Design goal:
monomer, alpha/beta, 7 helices, binds 1,2-dimyristoyl-SN-glycero-3-phosphocholine, binds zinc ion, hydrolase, serine-type endopeptidase activity, metalloprotease, secreted
């Protein structure tokens, strides 16, 4: 089947390699080319490729895989400590939206993704449409001012600030990415949106392959979505009641 990374110039691989560093600000194991190449061989194994040390655009696909291009550690304007909201009530506002698709495809899917987190965790989410809110969600073109290289269609699709009392909590989706609703020839917004919002709620990734924000995240709509309740158990301590026989 056709894809873009098989028709783009060889330059893509060093770009995609350079990209890997920014996921943590720095990564010590992605620094030195000896280690770059050792850790890219480890990427192929983690994803399940039949050749560790393949040179094929399939390997670019695992490097550019739908996720953000930002420090996914406490950083991207944050002190060292796990972020969480200081309440169980949070608001949100769709400040902006896409022209290739009507408003619904945002407003109903951010809400639905927040509903995914907020049925399990007793988090209340209120929609603001005029006024101040906690989570300012916008769709933007990437000339508007964030660190790192700009981005259009291709690698990187949102950034998200973790729970903050002003400037934090908030996301900018990529309006130059082609998101779908009914058409299927885009990135599934609801899918992507979930971990974008998971950022806005202050969670991390999980080693459990039943987890949603497991890094081998994709573009198209899941068949077999599930949560690790094992991860969420320590989120339930932060917003939920203490109700053990020994601790209540
Ligand atoms: C008979 C004449 C009719 C003319 C109709 C023109 C269209 C009227 C309806 C649409 C207005 C469009 C406004 C516009 O595109 O703003 C462009 C930018 C806005 O920043 P931008 O990111 O585009 O939009 C941000 C807000 N967002 C994300 C929430 C949508 O903001 C700018 O780039 C700066 C805007 C500076 C305007 C200065 C004052 C202009 C006065 C014109 C008065 C003419 C009187 C005849
Ligand atoms: C007092 C007299 C009556 C007054 C009427 C009401 C006036 C209301 C003014 C509204 C100002 C709102 C502020 C603002 O940010 O407006 C932004 C708008 C809509 O934003 P939005 O709907 O978010 O789209 C954002 C821009 N986009 C597509 C690049 C992603 O951006 C636009 O809508 C862009 C407008 C582009 C117009 C370009 C020229 C079109 C030509 C029309 C004629 C064509 C003749 C062949
Ligand atoms: C010599 C003096 C005059 C010189 C005038 C020259 C041109 C001045 C233009 C200034 C603004 C240029 C910016 C521009 O073209 O905005 C375009 C807008 C919105 O673009 P937008 O949807 O933001 O993104 C466009 C994506 N694209 C190009 C791939 C389709 O596109 C439009 O909004 C067109 C969409 C259809 C509008 C329908 C208009 C029907 C007539 C309505 C009459 C209403 C009562 C007045
Ligand atoms: C830099 C400036 C360049 C020059 C600008 C020249 C004048 C431009 C006037 C505004 C053009 C408005 C175009 C317009 O969208 O007409 C149709 C709309 C909605 O049609 P719809 O298919 O929703 O939107 C099509 C356009 N799209 C894809 C670009 C969003 O119909 C509606 O949205 C319903 C509106 C009903 C209420 C109207 C109340 C205001 C009356 C006076 C408006 C005077 C406008 C100057
Ligand atoms: C009675 C016969 C009528 C004949 C045609 C008249 C054309 C007048 C404008 C009609 C515009 C239709 C309304 C509209 O806003 O269309 C915008 C389109 C593209 O919007 P876009 O969202 O790509 O459509 C995507 C649709 N989707 C999501 C389902 C894939 O398109 C654009 O954004 C650009 C549209 C450019 C229009 C240029 C009009 C210049 C007219 C001749 C002017 C001569 C001046 C001397
Ligand atoms: C002084 C400046 C002047 C500048 C221009 C001002 C005047 C502008 C006129 C603007 C009107 C444009 C309307 C237009 O583009 O309609 C397109 C339609 C399809 O619209 P459609 O895709 O349903 O709109 C979807 C929009 N969405 C996604 C937001 C829901 O297209 C159709 O559905 C076509 C249907 C044809 C049906 C059959 C008609 C038979 C006609 C036979 C006539 C006699 C033949 C001898
Ligand atoms: C006395 C005859 C006057 C005849 C011309 C009157 C002109 C009226 C201009 C109104 C300008 C509004 C500009 C703008 O949209 O401001 C938005 C604000 C708040 O927006 P926002 O907070 O989103 O509104 C939320 C509440 N909502 C949806 C239910 C409206 O909305 C507001 O805060 C409303 C602001 C109203 C201001 C009216 C100022 C009048 C000074 C008149 C001085 C004497 C003139 C001879
Ligand atoms: C004599 C009676 C007046 C008595 C005054 C008594 C004192 C009242 C003080 C009122 C204080 C509230 C002021 C105010 O903000 O009222 C807003 C309303 C509703 O605005 P709303 O739509 O809720 O918010 C809209 C957007 N916004 C905030 C950005 C401006 O504004 C509206 O409801 C007006 C809506 C006008 C839309 C008209 C568009 C169609 C015009 C014709 C178009 C023809 C096309 C062929
Ligand atoms: C007649 C000789 C020439 C004939 C050919 C004309 C060809 C015109 C070519 C148009 C080229 C642009 C096409 C286009 O799709 O533009 C869409 C834009 C959005 O671009 P987009 O990348 O979304 O945002 C760009 C932002 N910018 C301007 C800060 C870099 O939409 C805009 O940025 C919205 C425009 C908003 C301007 C603010 C209007 C304020 C009110 C002014 C009222 C003026 C009355 C005199
Ligand atoms: C009824 C009145 C309608 C007019 C109303 C007033 C509207 C005034 C708004 C002017 C908007 C200017 C915005 C602007 O400069 O943005 C840059 C755009 C497109 O940039 P773009 O191609 O996207 O590349 C820039 C962004 N990049 C590298 C990140 C991809 O554009 C450009 O790069 C090219 C700008 C070309 C201007 C050409 C003017 C030539 C005629 C001027 C008049 C001469 C006779 C007096
Ligand atoms: C003679 C007529 C007098 C007209 C006087 C109008 C006074 C209007 C006050 C507008 C105040 C806007 C204040 C403000 O900064 O709002 C912020 C938002 C978004 O801010 P921000 O997210 O930084 O936008 C980032 C995107 N960037 C940097 C790439 C452009 O962006 C905005 O909300 C967009 C504001 C666009 C408003 C354009 C005003 C002219 C529209 C046409 C009205 C025509 C009437 C016939
Ligand atoms: C009489 C009372 C008037 C009071 C009006 C109040 C206006 C408040 C506007 C707030 C607009 C908020 C959104 C805005 O910042 O858009 C910025 C855009 C592009 O952002 P960016 O591309 O990031 O450039 C940022 C830096 N800047 C502003 C120095 C160029 O910046 C640009 O694209 C520059 C836009 C330049 C103006 C184009 C419209 C001129 C209108 C011509 C009207 C002729 C009437 C006969
Ligand atoms: C007759 C001889 C003199 C006239 C010479 C005219 C030369 C015109 C150069 C016009 C600009 C060309 C570059 C251009 O298309 O920039 C595009 C952007 C955005 O297009 P748009 O689809 O929003 O881009 C969205 C993102 N995308 C690409 C991923 C789909 O658009 C923007 O960012 C906004 C651009 C504002 C342009 C203001 C000038 C419009 C033309 C005015 C001509 C008036 C002549 C009197
Ligand atoms: Ca992108
Ligand atoms: Ca905020
Ligand atoms: Zn993450
Ligand atoms: Zn930003």
């Amino acid at each position: 089947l056709p894809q873009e990374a098989g028709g783009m110039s060889e330059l893509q691989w060093e770009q995609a390699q350079d990209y890997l560093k920014r996921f943590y600000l720095y990564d010590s194991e992605t620094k030195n080319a000896n280690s770059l190449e050792a850790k890219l061989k480890e990427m192929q194994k983690f994803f399940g490729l039949p050749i560790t040390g393949m040179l094929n655009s399939r390997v670019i696909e695992i490097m550019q895989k739908p996720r953000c291009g930002v420090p996914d550690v406490a950083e991207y304007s944050l002190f060292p400590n796990s972020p969480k909201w200081t309440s169980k009530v949070v608001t949100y506002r769709i400040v902006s939206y896409t022209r290739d698709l009507p408003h619904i495809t945002v407003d109903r899917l951010v809400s639905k993704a927040l509903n995914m987190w907020g049925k399990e965790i007793p988090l209340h989410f209120r929609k603001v449409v005029w006024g101040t809110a906690d989570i300012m969600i916008g769709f933007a073109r990437g000339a508007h001012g964030d660190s790192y290289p700009f981005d259009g269609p291709g690698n990187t699709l949102a950034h998200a600030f973790a729970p903050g009392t002003g400037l934090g909590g908030d996301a900018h989706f990529d309006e130059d990415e082609r998101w779908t609703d009914g058409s299927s020839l885009g990135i599934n917004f609801l899918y992507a949106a979930t971990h974008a919002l998971g950022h806005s709620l202050g969670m991390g990734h999980s080693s459990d392959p039943n987890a949603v924000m497991y890094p081998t995240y994709g573009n198209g709509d899941p068949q077999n979505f599930k949560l690790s309740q094992d991860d969420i158990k320590g989120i339930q301590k932060l917003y939920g009641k203490r109700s053990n026989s020994r601790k209540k």
